[PDB]
Amino acid sequence: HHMSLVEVLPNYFTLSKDSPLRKKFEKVYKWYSPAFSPHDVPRFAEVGNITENPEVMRGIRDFFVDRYKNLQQPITHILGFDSRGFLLGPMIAVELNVPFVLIRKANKIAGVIIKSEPYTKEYAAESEECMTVRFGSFDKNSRVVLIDDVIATGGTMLAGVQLVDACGATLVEVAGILGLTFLKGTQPAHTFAGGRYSNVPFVTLVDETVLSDENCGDPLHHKGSRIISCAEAKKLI
Template identity: 40%
Template structure:
């Protein structure tokens, strides 16, 4: 199947003023209502990572779980959940980060990764980069390494992909939306 960036972008709904004025939310739910688009997205990611040294898929709460679970299954890799604070039941490590909406914390189970693991971090989009960088901090704290930060969408005007790359982490996205797009 050939990846079609136009098709993917056309199925991402812009929602101006959500969750607050001045923000245009990029809603991926219409994309997930199209089996063809879901297959295009997942097949593109699977092809990229099938022969990579990735040992774990790190899915970021909550929309990253959708893509992360499929990738973990298809690539036969363990799925590691990076969740909002207070959502994981066992012993966790946590990191604070800033988003375009405010401050937050992310956690992962302390026993989720071991030294030397190569983690593919996955979310629906890269905005300010705060969530990815906090997850990367936790990966590092557990002795593992981030192989790459991957998402369906990049919002380059918010600078997150540049911050992630400046931290020495490669990024990969399937499409990008400029501010006025």
């Protein structure tokens, strides 16, 4: 059940074009235009169509569990980003028998917490929002994987790298299910702190080629706002 990666940019890996798991993603991943999306990027890849497909979810789980089980030196923690990284990390961490550590927006986490620098995303300019992690959840002897759903500009991953760096831990790999390689999202993590993390592979199972013209999820016709009330929805039962 092994699936194969190809290095498409330096330390940016994605599944081969012919990979059976990629073909499964191609049938389920849909993108939405600004008219039907919470953020007006050209093609918004809704994670719910992935979580609604248990076969693809199992393929994601199996890929990363097998990958990290077969390392010569095991990982000790998986760190996942609020909110969509939360959907992917725990099912991997439970099979590896490692902690799943939450990286959360402001302060959401109780106790003593470490805050990143203010982050940016493909669709978010810098503001006061930072990512945080619980102090004491991992340390300088930890070997960690950062996981999210999408890697676009790499701003979110940079915030995670800053938090890993704040504890002196070893960053083994950055993991996701969709990498928009034309945005070169490896760059922030790979140039932070004078290149301290340039040897960290990014592994995103599929890439922008999954967001094909035939994979638009927009309704072909829809009355009014995409946001409907419960009473309006009941008339469609």
